[PDB]
Amino acid sequence: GLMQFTLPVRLCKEIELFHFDIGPFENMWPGIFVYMVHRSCGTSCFELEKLCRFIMSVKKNYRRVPYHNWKHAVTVAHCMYAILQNNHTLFTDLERKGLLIACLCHDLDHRGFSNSYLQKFDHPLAALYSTSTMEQHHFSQTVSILQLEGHNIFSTLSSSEYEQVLEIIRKAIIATDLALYFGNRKQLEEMYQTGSLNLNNQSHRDRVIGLMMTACDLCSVTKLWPVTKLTANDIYAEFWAEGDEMKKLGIQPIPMMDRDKKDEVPQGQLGFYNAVAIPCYTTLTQILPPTEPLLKACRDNLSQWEKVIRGEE
Ligand X SMILES: CNC(=O)c1c(NC(=O)c2nc([C@H]3CCOC3)cnc2Nc2cncnc2)cnn1C
CA distance linking residue 223 with residue 42, whole number of Å: 27
Q: Which is it for the CA torsion 7, 8, 13, 18, positive or negative?
A: negative
- 68 a catalytic residue: yes
Task: Measure Cα distances from 26 to 10, 58, 108 in Å.
Answer: 17, 14, 17
224 binds, among Mg ion, Zn ion, ligand X, none (CB under 5 to 8 A by kind): none
- Kindly indicate which of the ranges 105-113, 224-232, 249-257, 291-299 contains the residues binding Zn ion, using the contact rule CB under 5 A: 105-113
- Which is closer to Zn ion, CB of 55 or CB of 105? 105
- Which is closer to Zn ion, CB of 37 or CB of 80? 80
3-class DSSP state of 149:
coil
123 annotated among ligand-binding-site residues? no
68 annotated among ligand-binding-site residues? yes
- Which is closer to Mg ion, CB of 107 or CB of 242? 107
Residue 150 Cβ vs Zn ion, minimum distance, rounded to whole Å: 27
- Within residues 216-235, the interface with Zn ion by CB under 5 A covers 217
Residue 255 Cβ vs ligand X, minimum distance, rounded to whole Å: 7
Q: Which is it for the CA torsion 300, 301, 304, 306, positive or negative?
A: negative
- Which is closer to ligand X, CB of 14 or CB of 21? 21
Q: Which residues of 105-116 are buried (b: 16+ CB within 10 A; e: fewer)?
A: bbbbebbbbbbb
Residue 109 Cβ vs Zn ion, minimum distance, rounded to whole Å: 12
217 annotated among ligand-binding-site residues? yes
258 binds, among Zn ion, ligand X, Mg ion, none (CB under 5 to 8 A by kind): none
Q: After which residues are there C–N gaps above 2.5 Å in the chain?
A: none
Residue 18 Cβ vs ligand X, minimum distance, rounded to whole Å: 14
Contact between residue 165 and residue 98 where contact means Cβ atoms under 8 Å apart: yes
Contacting residues toward ligand X, per CB under 6 A: 178, 218, 220-221, 228, 231-232, 235, 256, 268, 271-272, 276
Q: What is the DSSP letter of 290?
A: G
- Which is closer to ligand X, CB of 39 or CB of 259? 259
Closest CA to 77 of 31, 126, 146: 31
177 annotated among ligand-binding-site residues? no
Contacting residues toward Mg ion, per CB under 5 A: 107, 176
- Kindly indicate which of the ranges 52-60, 77-85, 201-209, 215-223 contains the residues binding Zn ion, using the contact rule CB under 5 A: 215-223
Alpha helices in the chain (DSSP H): 9-14, 29-40, 48-60, 70-85, 93-105, 115-121, 124-128, 133-146, 159-175, 178-193, 202-217, 225-248, 265-272, 278-287, 292-309
Residue 213 Cβ vs Zn ion, minimum distance, rounded to whole Å: 9
269 annotated among ligand-binding-site residues? yes
- Which is closer to ligand X, CB of 224 or CB of 276? 276
Determine the distance from the C-alpha atom of residue 225 to the mean position of all C-alpha atoms in its chain, rounded to a whole number: 19
Residue 79 Cβ vs ligand X, minimum distance, rounded to whole Å: 12
User: Which of these is catalytic: 68, 110, 137, 151?
Assistant: 68
Closest CA to 20 of 223, 302, 228: 223
Helix or strand (DSSP H, E) at 20: none
* Residues flagged as binding site: 68, 72, 106-107, 217, 269
Q: Which residues bind Zn ion (CB under 5 A)?
A: 107, 217
Could you list the active site residues?
Answer: 68
* Residues flagged as binding site for a divalent metal cation: 72, 106-107, 217
* Residues flagged as binding site for 3',5'-cyclic GMP: 68, 269
